[PDB]
Amino acid sequence: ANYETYDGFKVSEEPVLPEKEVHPSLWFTKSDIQKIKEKKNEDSFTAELWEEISNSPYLTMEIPTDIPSATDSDTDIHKYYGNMSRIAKYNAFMYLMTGKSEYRLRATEALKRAFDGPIYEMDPTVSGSGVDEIYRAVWAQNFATAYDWIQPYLSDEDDEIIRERLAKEAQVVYENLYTWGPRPHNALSKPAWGLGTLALTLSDHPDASKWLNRALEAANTNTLYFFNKDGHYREGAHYYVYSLVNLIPFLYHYKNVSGVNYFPEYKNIFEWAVKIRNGRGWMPNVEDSWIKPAPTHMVASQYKDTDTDLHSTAKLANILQWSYFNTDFRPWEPDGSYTGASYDDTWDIDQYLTYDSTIEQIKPDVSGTVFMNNSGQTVFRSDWNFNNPNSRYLLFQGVAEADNHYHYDHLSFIIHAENQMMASDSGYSRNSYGEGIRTSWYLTAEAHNVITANGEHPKDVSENTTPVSRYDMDTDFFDFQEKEAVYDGFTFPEKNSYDFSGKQIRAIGFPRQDYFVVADQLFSDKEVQYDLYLHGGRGEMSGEGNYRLWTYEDDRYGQEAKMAAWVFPSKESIFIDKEGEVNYEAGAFNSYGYLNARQIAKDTMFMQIIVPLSKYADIPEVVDLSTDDVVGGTVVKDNEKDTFMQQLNNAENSLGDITTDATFAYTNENSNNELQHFSVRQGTSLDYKGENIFVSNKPITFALDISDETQYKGTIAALNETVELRVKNPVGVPTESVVVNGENIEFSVEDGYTVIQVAEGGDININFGE
Ligand SMILES: O=C(O)[C@H]1O[C@@H](O[C@H]2[C@H](O)[C@H](O)[C@H](O[C@H]3[C@H](O)[C@H](O)[C@H](O[C@H]4[C@H](O)[C@H](O)[C@H](O[C@H]5[C@H](O)[C@H](O)[C@H](O)O[C@@H]5C(=O)O)O[C@@H]4C(=O)O)O[C@@H]3C(=O)O)O[C@@H]2C(=O)O)[C@@H](O)[C@@H](O)[C@@H]1O
Ligand SMILES: [Ca+2]
Ligand SMILES: [Ca+2]
Ligand SMILES: [Mg+2]
Ligand SMILES: [Mn+2]
């Protein structure tokens, strides 16, 4: 695996340390302490956070006089060092906050027994080790923080003892960082930031410059490979948050101690979370990942002067604050831990010290639809409303495979709508990474919403190269994008030769921002077996032929609802009911229906029509009109007739009322059976009921709303060269202006048609008189 070719990001590796150690200074200086004590009375959140911290059993539990030996169980060794680190930090904090004698004594004794017992005897490369690098990253930050807090109140003797313990662990971590995490995943990054905290806590110690330099070096191998510039993490939401437990603290530690502010550089990893969140503020169960909330509140304070694309006027800080608190947290009751470190973390404290009660929660006001083409994700999204059933969310997953915690999920999608999780990623596993069922099922292509050719999964052209995206179109009435993966390409484990050569070109469209169309073009050099899968998450599957209906109930993830799905073409394809596991969180796995549509062919097409519905909604009337060269049909939902059409060539053909040379075409009628909205992929004409709507001298991809006869408005996808578009005016009405990207462009009117040269794409308004 090549770890240096992915379009990630890295910061300065130059170690910056202050002239002289200051304690406290990691989170705050001496001056801040009475402000922090008072903080508990700002709002109901700071109140709850204080209620939790001040009643922590780590203040009242007996410091254990039972040091466990090397040959004890891996769990008990974990919890010993976890509890000790926790006893140190919780007590050290509560001494600052109350001044109670006991708390200083407990903190001091716990810090004096930091990394006592068998830790340095044992081997962390061993799998699941009680002292694995990932756990002693949290421990290191817990003890180092505890020290920074109690250091002033220590005898010259106790200071020198505790300094030598933290300074040992620091040297051990420095020496064995790359041995423990030989590949740059979260097992390298987490303990690296752990070292970073230690280096900054003991800034005077002679080795600190070397410690911090490696800490930043090792961290940068993670951000260069597993992170994208645009903020995507390739280990998925779960290991993103697991990474945050150690990163977020270090980010603050290095600012507060050395005046090195990395928050601008790490900005996009927090924006990302908000962009891929569903109706209830959950990050998706993609790659080795459960559903996860994004702790964006704990960094909001640093982005008060940061612009975002997510609001016209407001600053990122306000959106980051909005995102966290607009998250359903019921899937983590009554415990409340979503970090992945519930044996080690001090999340109540770290939230107390980071939360800023002065930041106004502001909902994004921009188009919900977002195209993050650099990583390869894309979200169709009707609105940003929290826990609204009228909301529609589709994640379109086309991300270059990484070498750790990977699932085969190219051109997969998931859907959130009617407040339920519908079309599904089958999720991480039953429970853990080392389970057979993860390799035999959960990570396999078939456990996802893909198309396999002879069982081979759609994959990257070349390693660390994001699947190409085309025809990005966002509007009020219809969004659209296509992604291209290949079958005979690059994946993990590495597989150099294939019996054939083929590719998938999956287009997704968002008709009436209400339901979805998934229109696949498939090309191959040989005849092969295309298998389309469609998992309906955790629903009772029913229905025969080309139609399936998943019915959901009030579960731990949403409300009573249903998803209806039709597959085209009906005749050339066969439909196979199958049963597979779907898991959104540890231990909560179950078997559910999933559809296997199958064709045997060389070059062919599929089309899925997928419709979220509320429990007792009428099932739309969906008619297949597919033939030899043309796949597509008609949907009659809420008294409007939508028509879809795909083909493999720019060849004049018909379906329903459409006639076009476009590889894809969409139409919306109103109650009165008049064309209102239409979109085309690389068309040069479209007739509806045999009435021409537009023509062009070259192939153009655009969507247009023609429901208002004073103004036609839509968008035109990116252009390679000047096109002469000609749109038909409403009968006997003159064109006044044409606006593309808020600038006028030159227009004539010939035979009832507005005529424009367009050399770049963007939002178009054709403005009409009377
Ligand atoms: O607090 C809670 O809510 C629950 O937390 C639970 O803790 C979980 C965490 O949430 C994470 O899932 C954490 O992630 C670990 C995971 O436990 C495993 O250790 C897994 O193991 C593999 C590594 O990821 C990595 O792939 C490694 O690769 C090797 C590979 O074999 C090969 O030889 C190659 O050449 O070398 C590499 C290498 O670099 O070493 O193999 C590891 C393996 O063991 O197979 O890694 C993840 C990770 O990425 O960090 O796991 C904990 C956990 O304890 O389970 C849990 O405590 C639960 O009880 C709580 O309720
Ligand atoms: Ca993947
Ligand atoms: Ca839109
Ligand atoms: Mg290890
Ligand atoms: Mn998966």
Side-chain angles (χ1 to χ4, degrees), residues 565-597:
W566 296 259
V567 181
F568 310 152
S570 293
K571 289 153 195 172
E572 351 288 292
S573 305
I574 66 154
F575 306 104
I576 305 160
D577 285 356
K578 304 187 85 180
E579 193 155 83
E581 293 189 43
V582 179
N583 205 4
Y584 297 146
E585 56 194 341
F589 63 88
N590 274 278
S591 259
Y592 301 97
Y594 77 93
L595 173 73
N596 182 357

mmCIF file of all heavy atoms in Angstrom, residues 565-597:
data_model
loop_
_atom_site.group_PDB
_atom_site.id
_atom_site.type_symbol
_atom_site.label_atom_id
_atom_site.label_comp_id
_atom_site.label_asym_id
_atom_site.label_seq_id
_atom_site.Cartn_x
_atom_site.Cartn_y
_atom_site.Cartn_z
ATOM 1 N N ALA A 565 -39.614 0.408 -3.908
ATOM 2 C CA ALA A 565 -38.546 0.318 -4.927
ATOM 3 C C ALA A 565 -39.050 -0.491 -6.120
ATOM 4 O O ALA A 565 -39.584 -1.590 -5.896
ATOM 5 C CB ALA A 565 -37.321 -0.314 -4.322
ATOM 6 N N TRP A 566 -38.896 0.054 -7.328
ATOM 7 C CA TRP A 566 -39.099 -0.661 -8.613
ATOM 8 C C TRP A 566 -37.744 -0.766 -9.312
ATOM 9 O O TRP A 566 -36.958 0.189 -9.187
ATOM 10 C CB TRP A 566 -40.134 0.057 -9.483
ATOM 11 C CG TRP A 566 -41.510 0.091 -8.891
ATOM 12 C CD1 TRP A 566 -42.572 -0.701 -9.220
ATOM 13 C CD2 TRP A 566 -41.981 0.979 -7.864
ATOM 14 N NE1 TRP A 566 -43.668 -0.375 -8.465
ATOM 15 C CE2 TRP A 566 -43.336 0.656 -7.629
ATOM 16 C CE3 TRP A 566 -41.392 2.012 -7.122
ATOM 17 C CZ2 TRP A 566 -44.104 1.329 -6.682
ATOM 18 C CZ3 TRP A 566 -42.154 2.672 -6.184
ATOM 19 C CH2 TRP A 566 -43.492 2.335 -5.972
ATOM 20 N N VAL A 567 -37.474 -1.889 -9.985
ATOM 21 C CA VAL A 567 -36.233 -2.107 -10.782
ATOM 22 C C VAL A 567 -36.618 -2.318 -12.249
ATOM 23 O O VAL A 567 -37.574 -3.072 -12.509
ATOM 24 C CB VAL A 567 -35.408 -3.285 -10.237
ATOM 25 C CG1 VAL A 567 -34.127 -3.481 -11.035
ATOM 26 C CG2 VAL A 567 -35.099 -3.116 -8.758
ATOM 27 N N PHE A 568 -35.909 -1.638 -13.155
ATOM 28 C CA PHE A 568 -36.008 -1.786 -14.628
ATOM 29 C C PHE A 568 -34.658 -2.272 -15.154
ATOM 30 O O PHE A 568 -33.628 -1.980 -14.551
ATOM 31 C CB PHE A 568 -36.391 -0.459 -15.290
ATOM 32 C CG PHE A 568 -37.588 0.273 -14.727
ATOM 33 C CD1 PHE A 568 -37.670 1.656 -14.831
ATOM 34 C CD2 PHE A 568 -38.656 -0.403 -14.153
ATOM 35 C CE1 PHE A 568 -38.772 2.347 -14.348
ATOM 36 C CE2 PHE A 568 -39.754 0.291 -13.664
ATOM 37 C CZ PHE A 568 -39.811 1.664 -13.764
ATOM 38 N N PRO A 569 -34.588 -3.027 -16.277
ATOM 39 C CA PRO A 569 -35.770 -3.509 -17.002
ATOM 40 C C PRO A 569 -36.414 -4.779 -16.411
ATOM 41 O O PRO A 569 -35.693 -5.650 -15.962
ATOM 42 C CB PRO A 569 -35.211 -3.762 -18.408
ATOM 43 C CG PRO A 569 -33.756 -4.133 -18.184
ATOM 44 C CD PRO A 569 -33.328 -3.413 -16.926
ATOM 45 N N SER A 570 -37.752 -4.841 -16.421
ATOM 46 C CA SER A 570 -38.581 -5.892 -15.770
ATOM 47 C C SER A 570 -38.364 -7.242 -16.452
ATOM 48 O O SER A 570 -38.343 -8.264 -15.737
ATOM 49 C CB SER A 570 -40.040 -5.539 -15.805
ATOM 50 O OG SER A 570 -40.297 -4.410 -14.993
ATOM 51 N N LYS A 571 -38.238 -7.230 -17.781
ATOM 52 C CA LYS A 571 -38.298 -8.444 -18.637
ATOM 53 C C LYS A 571 -36.910 -9.095 -18.707
ATOM 54 O O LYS A 571 -36.837 -10.286 -18.392
ATOM 55 C CB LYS A 571 -38.926 -8.079 -19.987
ATOM 56 C CG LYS A 571 -40.417 -7.776 -19.890
ATOM 57 C CD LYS A 571 -40.949 -6.831 -20.940
ATOM 58 C CE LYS A 571 -42.324 -6.297 -20.591
ATOM 59 N NZ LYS A 571 -42.751 -5.229 -21.524
ATOM 60 N N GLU A 572 -35.852 -8.341 -19.026
ATOM 61 C CA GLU A 572 -34.478 -8.884 -19.264
ATOM 62 C C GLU A 572 -33.823 -9.311 -17.936
ATOM 63 O O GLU A 572 -32.789 -10.003 -18.003
ATOM 64 C CB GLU A 572 -33.525 -7.900 -19.968
ATOM 65 C CG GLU A 572 -34.143 -6.619 -20.525
ATOM 66 C CD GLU A 572 -35.021 -6.757 -21.754
ATOM 67 O OE1 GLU A 572 -34.476 -7.091 -22.818
ATOM 68 O OE2 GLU A 572 -36.243 -6.515 -21.646
ATOM 69 N N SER A 573 -34.358 -8.894 -16.781
ATOM 70 C CA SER A 573 -33.751 -9.103 -15.437
ATOM 71 C C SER A 573 -34.511 -10.187 -14.678
ATOM 72 O O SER A 573 -35.720 -10.329 -14.927
ATOM 73 C CB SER A 573 -33.755 -7.839 -14.617
ATOM 74 O OG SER A 573 -33.126 -6.774 -15.308
ATOM 75 N N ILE A 574 -33.843 -10.876 -13.752
ATOM 76 C CA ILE A 574 -34.511 -11.790 -12.776
ATOM 77 C C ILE A 574 -34.264 -11.256 -11.359
ATOM 78 O O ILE A 574 -33.186 -10.694 -11.110
ATOM 79 C CB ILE A 574 -34.070 -13.262 -12.945
ATOM 80 C CG1 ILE A 574 -32.598 -13.480 -12.600
ATOM 81 C CG2 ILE A 574 -34.387 -13.791 -14.336
ATOM 82 C CD1 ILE A 574 -32.299 -14.884 -12.154
ATOM 83 N N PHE A 575 -35.242 -11.450 -10.472
ATOM 84 C CA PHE A 575 -35.305 -10.875 -9.105
ATOM 85 C C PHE A 575 -35.265 -12.008 -8.076
ATOM 86 O O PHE A 575 -36.108 -12.904 -8.104
ATOM 87 C CB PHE A 575 -36.550 -9.996 -8.996
ATOM 88 C CG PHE A 575 -36.605 -8.948 -10.076
ATOM 89 C CD1 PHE A 575 -37.458 -9.085 -11.158
ATOM 90 C CD2 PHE A 575 -35.758 -7.853 -10.034
ATOM 91 C CE1 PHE A 575 -37.486 -8.130 -12.163
ATOM 92 C CE2 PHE A 575 -35.785 -6.900 -11.038
ATOM 93 C CZ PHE A 575 -36.649 -7.039 -12.101
ATOM 94 N N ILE A 576 -34.296 -11.943 -7.170
ATOM 95 C CA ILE A 576 -33.952 -13.029 -6.211
ATOM 96 C C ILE A 576 -34.054 -12.452 -4.797
ATOM 97 O O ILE A 576 -33.201 -11.620 -4.445
ATOM 98 C CB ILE A 576 -32.536 -13.546 -6.531
ATOM 99 C CG1 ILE A 576 -32.417 -13.998 -7.991
ATOM 100 C CG2 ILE A 576 -32.104 -14.628 -5.554
ATOM 101 C CD1 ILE A 576 -30.990 -14.064 -8.504
ATOM 102 N N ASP A 577 -35.071 -12.849 -4.029
ATOM 103 C CA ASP A 577 -35.190 -12.470 -2.598
ATOM 104 C C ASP A 577 -34.059 -13.172 -1.858
ATOM 105 O O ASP A 577 -33.862 -14.367 -2.100
ATOM 106 C CB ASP A 577 -36.561 -12.813 -2.013
ATOM 107 C CG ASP A 577 -37.650 -11.857 -2.466
ATOM 108 O OD1 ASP A 577 -37.313 -10.885 -3.179
ATOM 109 O OD2 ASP A 577 -38.825 -12.081 -2.102
ATOM 110 N N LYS A 578 -33.312 -12.425 -1.052
ATOM 111 C CA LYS A 578 -32.197 -12.939 -0.217
ATOM 112 C C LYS A 578 -32.320 -12.289 1.160
ATOM 113 O O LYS A 578 -33.218 -11.453 1.336
ATOM 114 C CB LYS A 578 -30.852 -12.666 -0.894
ATOM 115 C CG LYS A 578 -30.739 -13.231 -2.304
ATOM 116 C CD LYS A 578 -29.357 -13.120 -2.911
ATOM 117 C CE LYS A 578 -28.440 -14.255 -2.521
ATOM 118 N NZ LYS A 578 -27.101 -14.096 -3.135
ATOM 119 N N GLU A 579 -31.470 -12.688 2.099
ATOM 120 C CA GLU A 579 -31.590 -12.314 3.527
ATOM 121 C C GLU A 579 -30.176 -12.124 4.071
ATOM 122 O O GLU A 579 -29.371 -13.051 3.941
ATOM 123 C CB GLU A 579 -32.389 -13.390 4.267
ATOM 124 C CG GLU A 579 -32.842 -12.973 5.655
ATOM 125 C CD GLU A 579 -34.070 -13.698 6.187
ATOM 126 O OE1 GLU A 579 -33.912 -14.819 6.721
ATOM 127 O OE2 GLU A 579 -35.185 -13.137 6.069
ATOM 128 N N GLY A 580 -29.883 -10.946 4.614
ATOM 129 C CA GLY A 580 -28.540 -10.585 5.098
ATOM 130 C C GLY A 580 -28.606 -9.712 6.334
ATOM 131 O O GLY A 580 -29.691 -9.148 6.620
ATOM 132 N N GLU A 581 -27.480 -9.596 7.036
ATOM 133 C CA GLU A 581 -27.393 -8.840 8.308
ATOM 134 C C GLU A 581 -27.276 -7.343 8.007
ATOM 135 O O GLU A 581 -26.671 -6.984 6.972
ATOM 136 C CB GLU A 581 -26.247 -9.385 9.153
ATOM 137 C CG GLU A 581 -26.535 -10.791 9.628
ATOM 138 C CD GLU A 581 -25.566 -11.348 10.650
ATOM 139 O OE1 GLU A 581 -25.193 -10.619 11.581
ATOM 140 O OE2 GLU A 581 -25.194 -12.517 10.507
ATOM 141 N N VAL A 582 -27.896 -6.521 8.864
ATOM 142 C CA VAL A 582 -27.842 -5.030 8.851
ATOM 143 C C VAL A 582 -27.609 -4.565 10.284
ATOM 144 O O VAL A 582 -28.493 -4.821 11.116
ATOM 145 C CB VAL A 582 -29.143 -4.415 8.310
ATOM 146 C CG1 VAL A 582 -29.081 -2.896 8.335
ATOM 147 C CG2 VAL A 582 -29.475 -4.930 6.918
ATOM 148 N N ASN A 583 -26.478 -3.910 10.557
ATOM 149 C CA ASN A 583 -26.109 -3.478 11.930
ATOM 150 C C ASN A 583 -25.691 -2.005 11.909
ATOM 151 O O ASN A 583 -24.789 -1.652 11.123
ATOM 152 C CB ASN A 583 -25.029 -4.375 12.541
ATOM 153 C CG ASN A 583 -25.078 -4.370 14.053
ATOM 154 O OD1 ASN A 583 -25.963 -3.749 14.636
ATOM 155 N ND2 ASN A 583 -24.144 -5.052 14.694
ATOM 156 N N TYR A 584 -26.340 -1.188 12.746
ATOM 157 C CA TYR A 584 -26.102 0.272 12.869
ATOM 158 C C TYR A 584 -25.248 0.580 14.112
ATOM 159 O O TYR A 584 -24.688 1.693 14.161
ATOM 160 C CB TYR A 584 -27.432 1.025 12.924
ATOM 161 C CG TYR A 584 -28.327 0.936 11.707
ATOM 162 C CD1 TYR A 584 -29.704 0.923 11.861
ATOM 163 C CD2 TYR A 584 -27.833 0.943 10.413
ATOM 164 C CE1 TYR A 584 -30.565 0.878 10.780
ATOM 165 C CE2 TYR A 584 -28.682 0.898 9.316
ATOM 166 C CZ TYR A 584 -30.056 0.862 9.499
ATOM 167 O OH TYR A 584 -30.934 0.824 8.450
ATOM 168 N N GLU A 585 -25.149 -0.349 15.076
ATOM 169 C CA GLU A 585 -24.355 -0.201 16.334
ATOM 170 C C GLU A 585 -23.961 -1.582 16.872
ATOM 171 O O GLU A 585 -24.649 -2.557 16.548
ATOM 172 C CB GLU A 585 -25.158 0.550 17.398
ATOM 173 C CG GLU A 585 -26.501 -0.091 17.720
ATOM 174 C CD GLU A 585 -27.473 0.785 18.501
ATOM 175 O OE1 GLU A 585 -27.012 1.778 19.128
ATOM 176 O OE2 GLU A 585 -28.692 0.477 18.481
ATOM 177 N N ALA A 586 -22.910 -1.654 17.692
ATOM 178 C CA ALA A 586 -22.388 -2.914 18.277
ATOM 179 C C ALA A 586 -23.530 -3.731 18.902
ATOM 180 O O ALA A 586 -24.364 -3.151 19.617
ATOM 181 C CB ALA A 586 -21.317 -2.605 19.292
ATOM 182 N N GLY A 587 -23.581 -5.035 18.613
ATOM 183 C CA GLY A 587 -24.440 -6.014 19.310
ATOM 184 C C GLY A 587 -25.876 -6.025 18.812
ATOM 185 O O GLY A 587 -26.613 -6.923 19.251
ATOM 186 N N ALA A 588 -26.259 -5.100 17.924
ATOM 187 C CA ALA A 588 -27.661 -4.851 17.503
ATOM 188 C C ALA A 588 -27.878 -5.289 16.050
ATOM 189 O O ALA A 588 -28.571 -4.564 15.300
ATOM 190 C CB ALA A 588 -27.989 -3.391 17.684
ATOM 191 N N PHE A 589 -27.307 -6.433 15.675
ATOM 192 C CA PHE A 589 -27.387 -7.018 14.313
ATOM 193 C C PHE A 589 -28.698 -7.798 14.186
ATOM 194 O O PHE A 589 -29.248 -8.194 15.215
ATOM 195 C CB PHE A 589 -26.171 -7.907 14.051
ATOM 196 C CG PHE A 589 -26.074 -9.092 14.975
ATOM 197 C CD1 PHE A 589 -26.700 -10.288 14.650
ATOM 198 C CD2 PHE A 589 -25.379 -9.005 16.174
ATOM 199 C CE1 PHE A 589 -26.624 -11.378 15.504
ATOM 200 C CE2 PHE A 589 -25.302 -10.096 17.027
ATOM 201 C CZ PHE A 589 -25.925 -11.279 16.690
ATOM 202 N N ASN A 590 -29.166 -8.000 12.952
ATOM 203 C CA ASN A 590 -30.410 -8.744 12.607
ATOM 204 C C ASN A 590 -30.441 -9.000 11.094
ATOM 205 O O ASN A 590 -29.751 -8.268 10.354
ATOM 206 C CB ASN A 590 -31.663 -7.993 13.064
ATOM 207 C CG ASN A 590 -32.038 -8.301 14.496
ATOM 208 O OD1 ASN A 590 -32.675 -9.316 14.754
ATOM 209 N ND2 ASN A 590 -31.650 -7.443 15.430
ATOM 210 N N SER A 591 -31.203 -10.003 10.653
ATOM 211 C CA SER A 591 -31.345 -10.385 9.223
ATOM 212 C C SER A 591 -32.579 -9.701 8.636
ATOM 213 O O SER A 591 -33.611 -9.635 9.329
ATOM 214 C CB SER A 591 -31.413 -11.882 9.043
ATOM 215 O OG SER A 591 -30.162 -12.395 8.604
ATOM 216 N N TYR A 592 -32.463 -9.205 7.404
ATOM 217 C CA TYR A 592 -33.559 -8.517 6.678
ATOM 218 C C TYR A 592 -33.460 -8.835 5.187
ATOM 219 O O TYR A 592 -32.342 -9.011 4.666
ATOM 220 C CB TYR A 592 -33.510 -7.008 6.934
ATOM 221 C CG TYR A 592 -33.618 -6.629 8.389
ATOM 222 C CD1 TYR A 592 -32.484 -6.364 9.142
ATOM 223 C CD2 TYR A 592 -34.848 -6.563 9.023
ATOM 224 C CE1 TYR A 592 -32.569 -6.035 10.485
ATOM 225 C CE2 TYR A 592 -34.951 -6.234 10.364
ATOM 226 C CZ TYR A 592 -33.808 -5.972 11.098
ATOM 227 O OH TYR A 592 -33.899 -5.644 12.418
ATOM 228 N N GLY A 593 -34.617 -8.898 4.529
ATOM 229 C CA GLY A 593 -34.725 -8.965 3.063
ATOM 230 C C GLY A 593 -33.780 -7.986 2.392
ATOM 231 O O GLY A 593 -33.534 -6.887 2.965
ATOM 232 N N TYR A 594 -33.229 -8.395 1.245
ATOM 233 C CA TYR A 594 -32.533 -7.521 0.265
ATOM 234 C C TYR A 594 -32.685 -8.139 -1.126
ATOM 235 O O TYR A 594 -32.658 -9.363 -1.240
ATOM 236 C CB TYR A 594 -31.081 -7.262 0.689
ATOM 237 C CG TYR A 594 -30.083 -8.370 0.461
ATOM 238 C CD1 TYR A 594 -29.328 -8.417 -0.700
ATOM 239 C CD2 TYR A 594 -29.837 -9.333 1.428
ATOM 240 C CE1 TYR A 594 -28.384 -9.409 -0.913
ATOM 241 C CE2 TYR A 594 -28.898 -10.334 1.226
ATOM 242 C CZ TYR A 594 -28.168 -10.376 0.050
ATOM 243 O OH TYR A 594 -27.240 -11.353 -0.166
ATOM 244 N N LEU A 595 -32.872 -7.303 -2.141
ATOM 245 C CA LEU A 595 -33.211 -7.746 -3.514
ATOM 246 C C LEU A 595 -31.920 -7.923 -4.318
ATOM 247 O O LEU A 595 -31.062 -7.034 -4.246
ATOM 248 C CB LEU A 595 -34.131 -6.701 -4.147
ATOM 249 C CG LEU A 595 -34.456 -6.916 -5.622
ATOM 250 C CD1 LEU A 595 -35.420 -8.082 -5.803
ATOM 251 C CD2 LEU A 595 -35.023 -5.644 -6.230
ATOM 252 N N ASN A 596 -31.804 -9.043 -5.040
ATOM 253 C CA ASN A 596 -30.756 -9.325 -6.059
ATOM 254 C C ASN A 596 -31.454 -9.351 -7.427
ATOM 255 O O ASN A 596 -32.086 -10.369 -7.753
ATOM 256 C CB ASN A 596 -29.988 -10.608 -5.709
ATOM 257 C CG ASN A 596 -28.853 -10.984 -6.648
ATOM 258 O OD1 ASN A 596 -28.601 -10.331 -7.662
ATOM 259 N ND2 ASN A 596 -28.151 -12.058 -6.314
ATOM 260 N N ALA A 597 -31.400 -8.241 -8.166
ATOM 261 C CA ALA A 597 -31.708 -8.188 -9.611
ATOM 262 C C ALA A 597 -30.464 -8.652 -10.368
ATOM 263 O O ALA A 597 -29.352 -8.341 -9.916
ATOM 264 C CB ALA A 597 -32.122 -6.803 -10.026
#
